[PDB]
């Protein structure tokens, strides 16, 4: 493929890994969904404007919708993580191990 | 009775909400009285972004037009009257 | 004994007894119609 | 039918009932009525089936 | 019963359960089939549908 | 319609019901101190319905044919024996207890129902909220063991969480040596050997624990023994208080309507006062229970649901 | 949660499983996967605790991260196709992203490890949605993709979480992990026959989801959670501890019950493709199944447990709890066996 798709593939990839390699905080996991979802949004925006997709153009567009609608609702539950313990991190999140 | 106490309350107390609503019912409401809306759609369809491919010439088309002058086919004089 | 509250149930809902019969007659008469149909349809199609 | 004797008739029925049911197994299973070799013959004269 | 309705009966017995054998068999040697070389009603994956596409002259020649 | 979310979305809504006057009053006191009368005229002269205090038989008179129920269908649990030999082996000081804490939790649940509803208010004696004062007297006393405290405290944190206090906590203040010469004039010969240092650590848990705690949530009066004498004057203190503190500020419909489908469903009510937790004060063992609970289903109108029982005369049952 | 919310929240679960369900465009089984787990993240949340929040929380993480392998498949699928019809796909390692993110979304081994957490951190009721209606919209997925499933993907996962529900399950006393290892277990065989006839994953689907309602409703119907909690059905309503019996017997499979149907036609149909190594080790392993499913059958029915005093003031009150369907749903968990050739109806 063009090398274009090496870097943006390359980007899925890292923002992947960043996300299942989890630290203490849980906005920095959020941060690396984001990131997954914008290294889909232009490997998409890229197949679809270069093969001149016409009406594949709005689902770009579509795709950060629902983007919002995950960040918006990983940002509630953060509100409530925070709530209990006064943090957001990860390892408070343990007690259904029993 | 009810429907000029009710309307003289909120005028009162929230007059921004009630423009808000009348302004929003108008929108939805006077597309579909007004004359005018149906020649929107006609002076969209009358805007040539593309090429109009000719058609070849089979021997009984009578109501296509050999030349873009010829009396045959869509005319626009409703739009230079509009 | 004598309840000293009233059960729910103390007496019939008709509403629901007549509802729960009147279903169970309405299905059943168009089961057998429909049945009847089928059977009808199926000869004609066979030349029976 | 008395108020100490009616559950005693529900085993009674249910041979029969099974019984009746055991023969009507056999009526769908005439392909072969009078026509093995072993035992395929000429019908008496008021006879219409060998086996029923 | 008589021997000879119970030796009929075997007989119709016999022939239901070996016509039943007989299309147990070919139905799986059909589906061997089938699903091999994808020319039957069976195992037909679909393909894109046809009557999407637009014939219709396009805003440029060559397509 | 039986009340639900069909009949809260059709209207059903609290807020329709509530007045001013629509208003939870528990009246406290130590043993033999006026409460019951005190309870019963201010509920007759403000209009409200009036519970008398929770017993062992409460559950009795609110199902069925409203008798109390032979003594073994409620564990053979005993308040005279109680007081005749409070550290009896076979627990029965804890299992009562036990026992009544859950008739209260009913009772609680019971009018809450009530007032929720119809938005009557309702006059309670004593509560869910008070009842651990009895069980503080018993271990002070070592009339039970700790382990019974802890199963206490086990099951009351899983259950009060889900109410509202009441709204006003009347209090009679009556000193244990006037309320031990209150016995000895009452006649109980059970009741008479009740010492006064139990009686006293009643009177420390209400003052200790109890009214510290509900002040900060509820209107609470407290009246010596001869201001209680005039209820009038108690009715008059209540007409005029501010109710300015408390979760009952707090609510809303969504609330008492969440509140209203806990309250109506009294085996969800009862749900935790059975927690498997195996004290000898309360475990029952397989073969008496068995033997117990068949002879409770062959009580009179209890083998079915009510209203499906025709040894009492229940009819259309093939209809119902 | 107001009433009219509660059902416009419950009415948005279902329309995105029904979207991913009815479209044929990848775009548009994205958005039902996305639409449906907004909406199922507030009933989680419905009673708001620290563990319901904890769920919610391990549900919302496992969900998206499924969701961006997801449509990363179907936008590798775009390049190496140029379409996005919902049917097989166009290139191995899309098939692979997807096909690892539908084992998220269900839970499978090894993926399975939020299933037991969240199911014991919410209600009941929403545990039955979980384990239940959420498996439709992943299967209705795998049903349309499997001639392009890697085979010794597939398998591997089927063989992973039937040995892992299995074993789970032996060391749980709660019944909302006792239900999660079970669907963890049952899972396996829904994937395992997938490659050789979809039609046999939707029979245990269904059969599954009756006999795992029914068990979730009887469970609601007492309020129990624990298995001790539930030792107490025996002393107040008796006939619900036999219908939790005949039930749990149908779930470890034996005849004559129902659950032993789908067991049954999977053997069927991975015998006739020559696989037989592979139904044996998954028969054999399902008894763990048996095993904690009949441990809970002698706590419940086949013996008394001891009772608690306070017991007696619960026979004078009857239930009030819904349990809408409950009469239906055993009767179809138990007694369906002779029905079987009925199967045909979902081919
Ligand atoms: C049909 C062809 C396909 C074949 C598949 C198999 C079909 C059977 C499917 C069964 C479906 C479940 C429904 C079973 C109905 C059981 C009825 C029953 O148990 O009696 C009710 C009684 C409940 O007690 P109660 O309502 O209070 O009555 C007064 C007594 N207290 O019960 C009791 O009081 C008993 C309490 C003690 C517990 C004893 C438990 C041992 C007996 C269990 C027998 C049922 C086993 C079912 C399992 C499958 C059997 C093949
Ligand atoms: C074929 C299988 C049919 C299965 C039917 C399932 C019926 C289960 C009925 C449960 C008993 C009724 C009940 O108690 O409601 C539980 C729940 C509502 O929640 P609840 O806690 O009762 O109150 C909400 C107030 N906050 O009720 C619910 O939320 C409904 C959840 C179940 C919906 C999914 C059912 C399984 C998937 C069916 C697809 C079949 C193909
Ligand atoms: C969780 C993982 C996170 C990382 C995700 C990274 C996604 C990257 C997607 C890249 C997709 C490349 O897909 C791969 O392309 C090469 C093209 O040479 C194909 O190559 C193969 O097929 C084509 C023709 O079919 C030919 O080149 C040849 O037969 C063979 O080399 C592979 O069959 C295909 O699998
Ligand atoms: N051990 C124990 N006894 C209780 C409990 N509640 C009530 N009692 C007893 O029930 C009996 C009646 O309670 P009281 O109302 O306080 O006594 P009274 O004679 O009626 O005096 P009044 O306050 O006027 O009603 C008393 O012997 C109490 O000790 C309890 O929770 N535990
Ligand atoms: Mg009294």
């Not at chain 2, 109009?52 to 009396?71: F, Y």
């Not at chain 6, 009643?202 to 010596?224: D, H, R, W």
């Not at chain 7, 959670?225 to 939790?244: A, E, G, Q, Y």
Request: with cysteine; net charge neutral; proline share 6%.
């Amino acid at each position: 493929m063009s090398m274009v798709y090496m870097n943006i593939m390359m980007a899925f990839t890292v923002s992947l890994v960043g996300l299942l390699m989890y630290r203490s905080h849980l906005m920095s996991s959020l941060l690396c969904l984001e990131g997954m979802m914008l290294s889909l949004f232009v490997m998409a925006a890229l197949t679809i404007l270069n093969s001149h997709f016409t009406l594949a153009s709005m689902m770009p567009i579509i795709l950060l919708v629902f983007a919002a609608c995950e960040a918006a609702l990983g940002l509630s539950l953060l509100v409530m993580v925070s709530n209990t313990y006064g943090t957001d991190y990860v390892q408070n999140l343990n007690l259904l191990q029993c | 009775e009810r429907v000029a106490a009710f309307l003289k309350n909120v005028w009162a107390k929230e007059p921004v909400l009630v423009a808000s609503f009348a302004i929003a019912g108008l929108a939805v409401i006077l597309p579909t009285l007004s004359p005018y809306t149906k020649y929107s759609l006609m002076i969209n369809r009358a805007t040539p972004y593309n090429y109009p491919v000719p058609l070849r010439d089979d021997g009984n088309m009578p109501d296509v037009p050999s030349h873009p002058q010829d009396p045959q086919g869509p005319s626009l004089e409703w739009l230079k009257r509009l | 004994k004598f309840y000293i509250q009233e059960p729910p149930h103390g007496s019939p809902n008709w509403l629901k007894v007549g509802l729960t019969l009147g279903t169970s007659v309405f299905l059943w008469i168009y089961l057998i119609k429909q049945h009847n149909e089928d059977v009808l349809e199926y000869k004609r199609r066979n030349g029976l | 039918v008395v108020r100490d004797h009616w559950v005693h008739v529900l085993v009674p029925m249910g041979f029969v009932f099974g019984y009746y049911l055991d023969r009507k197994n056999d009526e769908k299973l005439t392909a072969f009525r009078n026509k093995s070799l072993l035992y395929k013959r000429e019908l008496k004269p008021n006879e219409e089936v060998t086996w029923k | 019963d008589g021997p000879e309705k119970n030796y009929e009966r075997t007989m119709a017995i016999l022939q239901i359960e070996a016509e039943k054998a007989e299309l147990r068999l070919k139905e799986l040697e059909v589906r061997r089939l089938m699903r091999a070389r994808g020319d039957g009603p069976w195992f037909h994956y679909p393909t894109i549908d046809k009557e999407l596409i637009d014939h219709s002259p396009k805003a440029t020649p060559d397509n | 319609l039986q009340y639900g979310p069909l009949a809260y979305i059709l209207g059903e809504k609290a807020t329709k019901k509530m007045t001013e006057k629509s208003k939870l009053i528990t009246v406290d006191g130590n043993i033999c101190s006026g409460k019951s009368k005190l309870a019963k005229e201010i509920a007759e002269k403000l209009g409200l319905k009036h519970f008398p205090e929770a017993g062992i038989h409460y559950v009795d008179s609110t199902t069925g044919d409203g008798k109390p129920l032979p003594v073994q269908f409620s564990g053979n649990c005993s308040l005279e024996k109680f007081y005749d030999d409070p550290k009896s082996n076979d627990g029965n000081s804890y299992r009562l207890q036990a026992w009544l804490y859950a008739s209260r939790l009913l009772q609680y649940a019971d009018a809450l129902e009530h007032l929720l509803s119809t938005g009557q208010g309702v006059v309670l004696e004593r509560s869910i909220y008070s009842d651990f004062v009895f069980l503080e007297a018993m271990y002070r006393q070592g009339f039970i063991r700790k382990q019974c405290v802890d199963h206490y405290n086990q099951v009351k944190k899983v259950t009060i969480c889900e109410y509202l206090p009441p709204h006003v906590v009347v209090y009679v203040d009556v000193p244990v040596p006037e309320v031990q010469s209150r016995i000895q004039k009452k006649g109980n010969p059970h009741e008479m050997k009740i010492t006064s240092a139990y009686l006293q650590d009643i009177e420390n848990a209400y003052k200790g624990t109890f009214l510290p705690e509900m002040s900060e949530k509820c209107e609470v009066l407290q009246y010596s023994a001869w201001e209680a004498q005039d209820a009038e004057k108690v009715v008059e203190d209540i007409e005029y208080l501010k109710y300015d503190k408390g979760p009952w500020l707090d609510q809303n419909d969504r609330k008492l309507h969440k509140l209203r489908m806990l309250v109506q469903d009294k085996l969800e009510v009862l749900n935790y006062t059975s927690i498997p937790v195996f004290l000898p004060e309360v475990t029952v063992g397989a073969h008496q229970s068995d033997q117990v609970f068949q002879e409770f289903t062959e009580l009179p109108g209890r083998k079915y649901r009510a209203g499906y029982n025709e040894d009492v005369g229940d009819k259309w049952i093939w209809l119902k | 949660m107001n009433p009219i919310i509660f059902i416009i929240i419950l009415l948005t679960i279902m329309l995105g499983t029904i979207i991913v369900m009815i479209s044929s465009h990848w775009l548009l089984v994205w958005i039902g996967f996305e639409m449906n787990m907004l909406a199922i993240i507030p009933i989680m949340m419905k009673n708001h605790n620290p563990r319901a929040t904890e769920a919610s929380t391990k549900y919302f993480l496992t969900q998206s991260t499924a969701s961006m392998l997801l449509m990363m498949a179907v936008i590798i699928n775009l390049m190496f196709s140029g379409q996005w019809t919902v049917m097989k796909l166009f290139n191995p390692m899309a098939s692979m992203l997807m096909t690892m993110a539908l084992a998220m979304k269900l839970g499978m081994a090894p993926f399975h490890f939020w299933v037991p957490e969240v199911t014991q951190g919410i209600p009941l009721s929403s545990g039955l949605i979980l384990l239940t209606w959420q498996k439709l919209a992943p299967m209705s997925v795998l049903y349309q993709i499997f001639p392009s499933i890697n085979l010794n993907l597939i398998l591997t996962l089927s063989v992973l979480s039937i040995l892992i529900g299995g074993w789970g399950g032996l060391n749980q006393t709660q019944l909302r992990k006792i239900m999660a290892y079970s669907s963890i277990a049952h899972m396996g065989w829904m994937t395992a026959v997938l490659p050789y006839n979809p039609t046999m994953t939707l029979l245990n689907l269904i059969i599954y989801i009756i006999m795992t309602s029914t068990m979730f409703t009887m469970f609601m119907a007492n309020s129990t959670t624990t298995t001790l909690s539930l030792s107490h059905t025996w002393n107040k309503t008796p006939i619900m501890t036999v219908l939790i019996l005949a039930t749990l017997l149908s779930m470890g499979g034996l005849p004559p019950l129902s659950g032993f149907m789908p067991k049954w036609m999977i053997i069927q149909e991975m015998t006739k493709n020559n696989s037989i190594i592979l139904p044996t080790f998954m028969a054999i392993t399902a008894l763990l199944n048996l095993y904690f499913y009949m441990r809970l059958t002698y706590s419940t029915t086949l013996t008394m447990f001891p009772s608690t005093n306070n017991m007696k003031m619960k026979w004078q009150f009857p239930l009030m709890k819904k349990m809408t369907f409950l009469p239906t749903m055993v009767v179809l968990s138990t007694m369906m066996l002779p029905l079987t050739p009925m199967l045909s109806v979902l081919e």
